[PDB]
Amino acid sequence: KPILAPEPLVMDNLDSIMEQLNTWNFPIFDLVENIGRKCGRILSQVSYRLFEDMGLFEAFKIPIREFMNYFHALEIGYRDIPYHNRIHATDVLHAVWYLTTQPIPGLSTVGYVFSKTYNVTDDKYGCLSGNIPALELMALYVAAAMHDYDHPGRTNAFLVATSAPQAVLYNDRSVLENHHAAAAWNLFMSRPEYNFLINLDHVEFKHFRFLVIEAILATDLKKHFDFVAKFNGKVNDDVGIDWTNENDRLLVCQMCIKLADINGPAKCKELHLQWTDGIVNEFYEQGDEEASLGLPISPFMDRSAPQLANLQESFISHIVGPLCNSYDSAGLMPGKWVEKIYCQITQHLLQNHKMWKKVIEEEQRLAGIENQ
Amino acid sequence: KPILAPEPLVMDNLDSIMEQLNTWNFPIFDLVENIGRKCGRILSQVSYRLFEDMGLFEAFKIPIREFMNYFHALEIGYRDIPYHNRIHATDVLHAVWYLTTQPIPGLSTVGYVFSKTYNVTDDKYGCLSGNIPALELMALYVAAAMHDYDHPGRTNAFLVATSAPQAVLYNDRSVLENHHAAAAWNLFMSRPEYNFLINLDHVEFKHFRFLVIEAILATDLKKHFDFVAKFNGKVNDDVGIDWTNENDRLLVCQMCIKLADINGPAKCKELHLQWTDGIVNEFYEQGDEEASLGLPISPFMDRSAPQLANLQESFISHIVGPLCNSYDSAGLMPGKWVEKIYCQITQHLLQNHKMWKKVIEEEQRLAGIENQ
Amino acid sequence: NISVDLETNYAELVLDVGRVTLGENSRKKMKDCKLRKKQNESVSRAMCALLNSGGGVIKAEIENEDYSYTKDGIGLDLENSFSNILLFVPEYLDFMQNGNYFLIFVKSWSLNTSGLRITTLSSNLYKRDITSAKVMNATAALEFLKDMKKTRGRLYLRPELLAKRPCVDIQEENNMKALAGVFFDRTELDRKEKLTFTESTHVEIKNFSTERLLQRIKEILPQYVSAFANTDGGYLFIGLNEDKEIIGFKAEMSDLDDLEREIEKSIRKMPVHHFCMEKKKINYSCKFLGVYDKGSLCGYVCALRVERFCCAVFAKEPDSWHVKDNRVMQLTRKEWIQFMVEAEPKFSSAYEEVISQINTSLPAPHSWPLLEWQRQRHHCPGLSGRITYTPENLCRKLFLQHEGLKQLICEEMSSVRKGSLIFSRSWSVDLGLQENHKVLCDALLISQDSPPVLYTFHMVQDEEFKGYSTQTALTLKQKLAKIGGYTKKVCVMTKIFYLSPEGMTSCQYDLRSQVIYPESYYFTRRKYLLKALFKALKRLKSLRDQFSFAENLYQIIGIDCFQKNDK
Amino acid sequence: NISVDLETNYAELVLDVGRVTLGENSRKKMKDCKLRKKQNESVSRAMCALLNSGGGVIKAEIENEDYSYTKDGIGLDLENSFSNILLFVPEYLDFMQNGNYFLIFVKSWSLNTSGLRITTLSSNLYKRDITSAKVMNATAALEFLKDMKKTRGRLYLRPELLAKRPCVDIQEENNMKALAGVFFDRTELDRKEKLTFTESTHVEIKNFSTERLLQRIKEILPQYVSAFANTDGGYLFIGLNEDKEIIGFKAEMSDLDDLEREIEKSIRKMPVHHFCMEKKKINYSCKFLGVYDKGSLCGYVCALRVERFCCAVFAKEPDSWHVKDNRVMQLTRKEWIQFMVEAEPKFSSAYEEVISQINTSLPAPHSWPLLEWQRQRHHCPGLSGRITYTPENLCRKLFLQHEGLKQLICEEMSSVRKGSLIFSRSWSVDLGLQENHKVLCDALLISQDSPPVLYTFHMVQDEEFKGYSTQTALTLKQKLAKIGGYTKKVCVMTKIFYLSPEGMTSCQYDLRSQVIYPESYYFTRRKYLLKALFKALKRLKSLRDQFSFAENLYQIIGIDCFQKNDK
Ligand SMILES: O=C1CN2Cc3c(ccc(Cl)c3Cl)N=C2N1
Ligand SMILES: O=C1CN2Cc3c(ccc(Cl)c3Cl)N=C2N1
Ligand SMILES: [Mg+2]
Ligand SMILES: [Mg+2]
Ligand SMILES: [Mg+2]
Ligand SMILES: [Mg+2]
Ligand SMILES: [Zn+2]
Ligand SMILES: [Zn+2]
């Protein structure tokens, strides 16, 4: 009766593709089509690979069967919509894993667990696993895996506008994120075979639950500039980052998942174009419903008058820009030296922003020509 | 089918008792027994009296029938428990009304509405209605009326301990207050005959809803010292209170309802003793349930080893003390001059604190005598 | 006096200090000490008045005939005064001789780590050191007044108890205080006797072997009264000599009453400012004692006892100036203490925090500045996207009509690497000023180099509009430096254009090729000017549409408006 | 030198400045100027070292035979030094002559509005005014160093462009700078010629008509080098006279190389501290020029050019002292700039904010103080509830055994209106010190009057325990004033008790009837001491059980622990 699992736990046709999982531009849609897209068990497989890499199946003695049970039930939980679906959650999980277990130039490390490979040889390269205990990272990964659970396909402002029951039920204060965390944890505690945290302490499980819920609640876009200003003020004039603080580690994981959930405009051009296609389709669905209820149609959400490039340029300039700036100025972005330093992420960001600025300029130029 | 109303709207046997409603020590239990305690329509009647006093039935054109409908449905909504019941809500409503519409020595006033009587004759007496528009006060009153709605009888920490569904559903962050506001507003929007805000604007109703939910969320005892410190820092070194600010007015109403919900130890001795009897009974119920589930029994919550006076003294010293201090040092407590100033509230507080200190001292003395 | 020169083509406050000698050797060999002191004081008044109210320029007519400044310098008294009023002289001052005029360009005072918000030539709050009554500098006066304002008074420990200390022969200042207390009530003094005590933090002694003694007391007493009332109270004896031999001053009867009258008048004239509930007066008391040699009265010794005060006591009004509208005035006592005691508001919401903190700009690219954004990225056909025409609806409409305007703006904006001009229906009203309806529109070009310019456009072939434009540029400069918090030297240039139909030319005025500034006023920074303009418009409550940061994405995401007490 | 007098019964740091003359007339008529300067410098070193490290007491042997201080005073050089190091002298200093010793009691330095965290006799960072090279005071040095640390360097505008200014005959300081730049490369100088330029913020001129000239340069050059490198760079010419007539100094060959060598040595010895990425050196260059009269060399003129520096340049190490353990030392440069640049942490969680802000205490009752709470309200049978025995479990257990202890505490706590003693297994380890196992327990009585006392209890009839108790009281006083932020004068008294079984008496020591303090050390405030003790214990990470604020109500309501980085 409960969503239990598929028969063989770790399917193996998707070998030699998870090997190229230590690269920032993971070909996620290739794996999606490779895996049977009929059913969808991508989230579970990528989660198993990542957790085996970190070694958390020995660092906490998590029984792999109940683990797969829970996460397959989770991926079944994700609705079938254009953007916020299980492919997106696998994206965000991989993004946080990469950001926390890949070499960071100029980071001084100090129970902790490192990535499987990681090539620990020098001192000028740190990783976030070398500053954050295993419990915090396991919490962060599970937070990323279940962070858009049962997404209705609408935004917070829409649910607040139409006064949806999810809006009344949560008092119009981060409706969707409360819903995601609530529904996910409910489903977790429902069955007994889902408890992949069976070998934890009372206090350990309490802390884990607290961190998971905090992480999921961090991805509320309304509280974006607040998080950015807090992370600026805590790296700019202070002593920097005292990693022994639990407040600092919490804020760092919150910023990390903030940056991971919005990572369309930080990959190669085709991947970002696919994500943008998804998000525009979802906005078009919402606008379609919104025009039918009599409400004035939302900006950017009119498939009969699209302003896609406007949206993407403004987004990259206002949302992902300052966030990546604050995340990098604190010297945490993963990159490499130059025998000063090369960072792939911000370069991709600049390239995509320039591309959308091309599209905007050309469109306005042609329209001003034709319409005089 | 919906809880509609009792037949004659404003019952009139409880005349000549609402006349003594401009006194801080309103004999609430006397009115309770006077009114038919079989059914319970006290909250609706006191609310009608207060709203007629403020004149909000002309200041906003609120149809009295739908008003009584909603508030009788509300008072039906309150569970039948020892402390958090409709008598308590009527208490808190009357407390906020008194605190905002009774003379305050040394307050300089400036659409606004004043109490029915108020005796406006001098300049050395202000009232909070002379600094806060009618919309904010109507929001505050309705927030007080529905602020403990459908109380389960347990505390937040208990629901978090046993992992109650109200705890999962709200992510363990002010479980009860979110539940109160959510359930109350849900019930409000359910029927069409409850809309006693029918003659409002879109923006007006939005602001009203925001203020009501903020007010109800202010009464979360976990966030007590935060509110006290914020109100200290905003009256101590600042320019004082710029009433044109909406932040200041919001914070003042939040502090006012904070002080109103905890007002047992600020009335005469017998009233406070009755409230204490109620709260100890409720804690005893919760401890009774807690010992049965195998959990170690909570402090103060053991009817087989009561520490009632300990609880009440520590409460008055830690919770109501500093709050009344911060509320008074900003020169808002209602009182009277001395032909320097006499305040009834803090005097009652000191008397009750001394009484509980007597009980503690005598008990410890006798126990040290007997047990050597 | 000091007069605001309304007859200059500078976009600034100009003060005329009258004739002024200059040069180290010309000042040194100047055979009129009172005149030299008066000139130095006039220049210092001018400089303080300029520092307190935005920027400004001091214009002094060279008094000596052949003056160079390139082989003469300025002087040494003026340099001392300058170095006293400021910490760093090169950061605030520029000196430039223009033929027969010596111009001093004064930056505006800025909030720094010291905490001072205005500059003062002298606080006039004296404090009593161990022995000497000194005047509080700016920092000590700040600390003193803020400690007093904190406790809503000035905390003393009036005689609740003498502590139970061991018995032992020990000597302290209270010994001298008590010996003075016994000296004060003595009914007679034997002439040429010795003293048992010397002067300390409670005791002062003066010779004053002066035939008049009243013109001297009238000028020396208030500073010692202030020194005492501002610390612990004390006694002031007159008629003694350095060797502690009581001599007194040869005064006959019918003058002691006059002297006491003048003393009471003088001490009642001294200002005072209370932070306590009640408002006392300076409690004090005089007395005179005979110095009878052997059977006859040789003279008297006036003994004055001053009791410690509850709030501050000035010798005169604080020496702080400012130019209000014209006719540079002195700050009243109440305003002075409000500038010394209160803080700045400094709200700085989270959105504004990030909008500013985009301006960190380490040695790295740090792209994505939010105060340089725009929807319509197609203006001025032959060009790149390197100029943000900010209002975006006022500019579009102003380009629709007034066809020559867009072409003129293109032909103007050609020689600019990167800038951002900001139109307006009228900038005078956006700075709280009188609008004149003949002004078509305005602009504000803020580029990297080339300090900001205030284009004024109009189509009226009768007037000149120099007064309007210069007043607006002046006010914008002052508002920037005093409210936006820009901490560098600035000049707001000017340009005027005529815009008759069928023709867009005839620049009726160009302020840059009319007036010279020091070498440093020509290098602005263009990101801090943007922060300063944002904060100035916010603080003036005129920020409406400048700095687009379009909300169509904010409305989707659920973020609210920029900032106000309106939600 | 200055030696920490380890042979005093004071619970404080005592410094011995050696013999010291005193009195205004004894100092004035002192016929040894070098000795007088040395004594004044020793006392000032002692006073700065005391101010920088908690409190302390300076002990000076009176050098003159018959000295009174009640008809002699102190002096005037010492008073000048005192008034320079401090703003207010009565707030920090107390002078008390004890027979043949002159004791100066020094309060500890406190954070005030100025922002300074340590006191310095002299920063040794010189700045170049218009004409003279002055030394930065404390406040200017603070401002300078903080502005530099902000920009991670020191911002200049290296020659990107000469601004396009109008053509007009105008005279400025850059004229003098350029004329010096042409003077510097001149290959020869005609003797007794005139100069075209004078000295300004970039130009300095020295006569130095000295036969040696090297002992003089070695001591005068570094301050001018610092004055230049700390502002805009510049030139320093030697061999000229006041009347700008080039004369030069009569130097023969084989000495110019020596002079250049000494100059390079001197300028390389001068300290420097960088806030920039790279770490340059002081870029400079010397040169010599002939002054050939008509066909022969009369002498030379050494011309030195100093270029503006990127970070700060000292003439010597900063003149700031402190006593580390003994043998009072001078703060290193790095520590000094860390005290001048960094801020204090000042976390102040919300719970702590309200726990302190209970301490406002306007002219009104303001009951309900949280740092004075207790569960067990029945101690000491015949008494009221007027003493909070705070740990409440250590005190209960210590009262269970050691039966005479409770009776002794009752017979001690009789004469106290309201106080709160705080037990401990050992206070020495709660202050980060060496524990000795023979100490039974401790206590800390903090009443309204009667400054705090540190009872030490033990049952060992062999030792005395004076050293332990006095070290602990000293350390507690210093920790209070330096970390708790108590801003008044304090002494921590002492008492020792013997506790043999079957008898509770024999107070083996009573520090109050052994040492005398000024009249003001005997009045504490008892609520700010509680705040200070709370903050000190928090900052030392030893706050465990003192200040109960029982959590059984907090655990019910849902409020969390007091504060730490543990949740
Ligand atoms: O490549 C991309 C990915 N995304 C996500 C996105 C957005 C605009 C709004 C929202 Cl709420 C979200 Cl999740 N734009 C882009 N562009
Ligand atoms: O007279 C009174 C009224 N109350 C309410 C109360 C309390 C202790 C805890 C809680 Cl949560 C509450 Cl609501 N004590 C008293 N005493
Ligand atoms: Mg989301
Ligand atoms: Mg997401
Ligand atoms: Mg509640
Ligand atoms: Mg309640
Ligand atoms: Zn006063
Ligand atoms: Zn450097």
Numbering used by the authors:
A (entry chain A), B (entry chain C): 669 to 778, 800 to 1028, 1070 to 1102
C (entry chain B), D (entry chain D): 2 to 568
Article sentences:
PDE3A is a phosphodiesterase that catalyzes the hydrolysis of cyclic adenosine monophosphate (cAMP) or cyclic guanosine monophosphate (cGMP). A structurally diverse group of chemicals, including 17-β-estradiol (E2), anagrelide, nauclefine, and DNMDP, induces apoptosis by forming complexes with phosphodiesterase 3A (PDE3A) and Schlafen 12 protein (SLFN12). They do so by binding to the PDE3A enzymatic pocket that allows the compound-bound PDE3A to recruit and stabilize SLFN12, which in turn blocks protein translation, leading to apoptosis. The PDE3A-SLFN12 complexes exhibit a butterfly-like shape, forming a heterotetramer with these small molecules, which are packed in a shallow pocket in the catalytic domain of PDE3A.
Our previous screening efforts using an FDA-approved compound library showed that anagrelide dose-dependently induced HeLa cells death. To investigate the molecular basis of the PDE3A-SLFN12 complex triggered by those compounds, we subjected the purified protein complexes to single-particle cryo-EM analysis and determined the structures of the SLFN12-PDE3A complexes with anagrelide (3.4 Å resolution), DNMDP (3.2 Å) or nauclefine (3.2 Å). The detailed cryo-EM structure clearly indicated that anagrelide acts as a molecular glue to form a stable ternary complex with PDE3A and SLFN12. Taking anagrelide as an example, the hydrogen-bonding interaction networks are formed between PDE3A enzymatic pocket and the hydrophilic imidazolidinone moiety of anagrelide. The H-bond network involves the carbonyl group of anagrelide and the nitrogen in the side chain of H961, and the nitrogen atoms of anagrelide with the side chain of Q1001. Additionally, anagrelide is stacked with the phenyl ring in the side chain of PDE3A’s F1004. SLFN12’s helix is positioned at the mouth of the PDE3A enzymatic pocket, and the side chains of its L554, I557, and I558 residues comprise a highly hydrophobic moiety for interactions with the hydrophobic phenyl ring of anagrelide, together with the L910, I951, I968, F972, L1000, and F1004 residues of PDE3A. Anagrelide’s phenyl moiety engaged in pi−pi stacking with PDE3A’s F1004, which was essential for its binding to PDE3. We also observed that the 7-Cl group of anagrelide engages in hydrophobic interactions with PDE3A and SLFN12, specifically with PDE3A’s T844, F972, L910, and SLFN12’s I557, I558. The hydrophobic interaction mediated by anagrelide plays a central role at the PDE3A-SLFN12 heterodimer interaction interface, although there are also three hydrogen bonds dispersed at distant sites. We thus chose anagrelide over the other two small molecules to further optimization based on the anagrelide-induced PDE3A-SLFN12 structure.
